[PDB]
């Protein structure tokens, strides 16, 4: 019961990515990495606008974003790519098609993004409010090491659960399984997130690459 309003979360989401990125008339990894760095800056902006995030100890705010940026960004670009054919759409306006993802040695994880995230979000018509709540759930992860008050982070996570649940009930009353189907997108996001972090550890390691560097 909206100690965590879904209207605000939707606001925080709508605060990124406009029409002007038509285009500006390949190396997918550098393109993806460049989109990542860009979106890392807007991620702090997103987080500030998620209810009660700012009200948390600052060091905590730092670790939550340190722990979840990875999944938080993958969640966003995946949902943005719902209408695209065999690819993703970056926040810089570029497409990455799968063949260049294979060409760059990252085909396997890339195809997982397409099947376990994008295609699933498309088939259920996940909405932006839903996407924002899931990201907030990923944000408020109380097992992250270094947290001063994990039970406060757990409390916030649980408020997203109740509020997202209420939202799905009101908006989609003919789909009583909707709230569970949303939460069940998270295991694939975690797996993908982990594999992606290893690939970046690798690209950092060989010098294939600023805010992003800090995050790694």
């Amino acid at each position: 019961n909206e100690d965590m309003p879904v209207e605000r979360i939707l606001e925080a989401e709508l605060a990124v990515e406009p029409k002007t990125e038509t285009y500006v008339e390949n190396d997918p990894v550098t393109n993806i990495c460049q989109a990542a760095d860009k979106q890392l800056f807007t991620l702090v902006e997103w987080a500030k606008r998620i209810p009660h995030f700012s009200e948390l100890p600052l060091d905590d705010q730092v670790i939550l974003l340190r722990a979840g940026w990875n999944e938080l960004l993958i969640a966003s670009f995946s949902h943005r790519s719902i209408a695209v054919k065999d690819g993703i759409l970056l926040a810089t306006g570029l497409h990455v098609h799968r063949n260049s993802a294979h060409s760059a040695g990252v085909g396997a994880i890339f195809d997982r993004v397409l099947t376990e995230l994008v295609s699933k979000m498309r088939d259920m018509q996940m909405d932006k409010t839903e996407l924002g709540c899931l990201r907030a759930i990923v944000l408020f992860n109380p097992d992250s090491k270094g947290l001063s008050n994990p039970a406060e982070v757990e409390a916030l996570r649980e408020k997203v659960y109740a509020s997202l649940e209420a939202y799905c009930k009101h908006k989609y009353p003919e789909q009583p399984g909707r709230f569970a189907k949303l939460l069940l997108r998270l295991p694939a996001l975690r797996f993908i997130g982990l594999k992606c972090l290893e690939h970046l550890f690798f690209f950092k390691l060989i010098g294939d690459t600023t805010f992003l560097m800090e995050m790694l």
């Binding site: 702090v44 600052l58 600023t210």
Partner: peptide, 9 residues
């Protein structure tokens, strides 16, 4: 580093 600064702003 950046992250810290960006938060406090």
């Amino acid at each position: 580093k950046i992250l810290h600064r960006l938060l406090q702003e």
